[PDB]
Amino acid sequence: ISEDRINTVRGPITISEAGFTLTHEHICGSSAGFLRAWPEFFGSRAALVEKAVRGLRRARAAGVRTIVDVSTFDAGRDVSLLAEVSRAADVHIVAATGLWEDPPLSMRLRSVEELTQFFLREIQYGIEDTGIRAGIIKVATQGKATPFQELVLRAAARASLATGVPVTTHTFASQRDGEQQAAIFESEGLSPSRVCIGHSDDTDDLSYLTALAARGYLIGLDGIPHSAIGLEDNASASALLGNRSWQTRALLIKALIDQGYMKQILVSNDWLFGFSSYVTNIMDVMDSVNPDGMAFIPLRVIPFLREKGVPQETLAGITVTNPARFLSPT
């Protein structure tokens, strides 16, 4: 004698309970404190809850059982909101720590050691006074890392090594940010199998993606429905969503399957039910081109890949097996 679980906003769950998992989503993309200070920007807090519950229930009916909400502190993560909508839609939600693209002064001024302590607090102790523990660490670059972003990448690697929770990233994929992120992570001793290089469907450079995957990284093809096709007269929507079709993004899933990387693909929508960190109309514009919301992956992408010949066992591997392996702490 003397010689299994993932944290969600409702508490620990076993691996088997996660099921079909969307690995990069947002209940509400905002800013720290903003939902509490100005809920009327979203109509009301109650209206945002109702919208998220409706959308999550639709995703659940399409087969989704878990989402990973990769909103950080500076993306306005409100874990109490996540917990309310998770409960009322009966969909598990994994919450995130880390930092995204808009850290305030009180974060931007901190050392790598301080950031490590903050990420560890959110994983090991809880987020705010809620007792809800993060189950993933989110980081971001937008091209070459700023000095602070390098600190965040290192603190994320250290927090991952101390807890076993994985790291997921925002990239400027066309600037191959995953390469710099990988270099910094490996300089900290982090295993590539603990890292998802996200927004990787924003590029068509397959050689960039297969080289990362041949190093063991997971590849996040996570913005499949993001497209401004049909919105060409809308500059702000076009700038955010791009002019590449959802089908072009979905073809990358098949391409990576065909190149042997099915065990390293993670798929998602990068959808939201509220969105205050961009132009005012953006949520309504996005909803007008993708009414399916987070159900877009199961309702549209799965049939598209099935028509292309991808067998169901491969699709189950990508949507069930891969997220469970990634999220289970090492």
Added chain:
Amino acid sequence: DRINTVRGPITISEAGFTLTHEHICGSSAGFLRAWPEFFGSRAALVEKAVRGLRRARAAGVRTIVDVSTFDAGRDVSLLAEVSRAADVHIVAATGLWEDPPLSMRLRSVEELTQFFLREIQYGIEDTGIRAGIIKVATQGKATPFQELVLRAAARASLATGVPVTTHTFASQRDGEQQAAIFESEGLSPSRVCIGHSDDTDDLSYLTALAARGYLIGLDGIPHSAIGLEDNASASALLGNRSWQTRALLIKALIDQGYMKQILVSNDWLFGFSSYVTNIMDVMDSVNPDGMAFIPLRVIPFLREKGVPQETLAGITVTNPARFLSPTLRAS
């Protein structure tokens, strides 16, 4: 007639000796709640703030204006707790300071006006506490977004009657552009305090604004890194001008006839996360009196320089009362 505080409305007469530019905790939105251990704990910050407010109260202070905005990490529930425990009135602020997040930076002048009106007319967050002042900031020539903030502040002030108070880079004469923008919106100068005005020695700049009816915020009197020359971060923040140099600007404005335009404060805090990690400890070593520095140090200094007590009472009691009392709403 009544001034909104974190404990509800108070009569103008209850405000008493008022410090018009202070902070319980200078932070970032959501930060105190997400990482209270940065301050030791929330409980430690409460105890420190209550002790510091009691020290100010024993020295005669009865009200402070906490000019922390949303993006400076204002936690009005913290303000209410410490105000009640220390029995010092606290007026809370709306507006935006120097660190707005994307969800604010992307907003139009109309949207910002709505947000400021929400915090004044409805309440801050879900607390029911209404803001009694609007805080805005520039650090040099205004950015396009800062111009929107100045205009929204003017519009919210005209609609509600609550005054406007500003952060300036005083040595770059920011108050002149702020005044121009406020006046283009029809805002009365007597409802505007041009803050951090003690950061400059240019009396011609200060007296010209005062002559136009602007209030002059000499609000950082104890900020000095004299003796801390080997500390670059403290030197950059606090400057190398003495508290006596800053205090003598109060006398200079009095001597030139502008007593009625003066407001005085410490610009102190009990927690501070938006700068380098040890700053609050360093500031506390410089000024253990905290917010009591104005009454315990500046008043006796000016008294012995010949400023009558009744003049100092007018500056610390009557001037803030006139500033904070809301004007009639437009229409």
